[PDB]
């Protein structure tokens with residue numbers, strides 16, 4: 001589990017969105033596994049605006065933050081999970097690291113701010129849904 005709290009927005013994995021998220025929806029995209037809802041309180045996270053390929057992510061199944069190198073956001077075939085059939089996921093970045101289903105929502109960050117959230121896992125890989133192109137999160 002986990003979210004990004006920037007401005008009056010809450011960014012979560014679409015597959016983990018709650019009824020309150022869907023009842024206060026700003027934007028959602030199944031192909032990216034992302035959903036954004038509105039919040040009453042202002043958040044403290046800041047979004048990175050860059051093309052970094054190194055950063056640090058939080059892994060809840062290890063209670064640890066790991067430094068990783070990751071690929072640029074791309075269209076990748078992701079195997080079936082409990083939440084999606086095997087399909088192409090867009091704006092996804094991969095790194096070598098540990099990721100179990102419940103690790104979704106952990107933040108990946110670089111020197112400029114939050115880069116994305118954990119979205120995929122298995123086989124010693126971790127995949128992150130990028131948010132750096134969503135410029136509207138800043139206003």
Ligand SMILES: Cc1cnc(CNS(=O)(=O)C[C@@H](C)c2ccccc2)o1
Pocket residue numbers: 076077078079080081082094099100101102103104119120121122125127
């Ligand atoms: C990059 C890639 C291709 N095929 C896959 C694996 N697909 S999945 O990540 O949707 C599987 C899911 C159960 C999960 C496991 C662990 C963590 C977060 C989700 O990943």
Ligand SMILES: [Zn+2]
Pocket residue numbers: 048049050051052110111112113
């Ligand atoms: Zn950066």
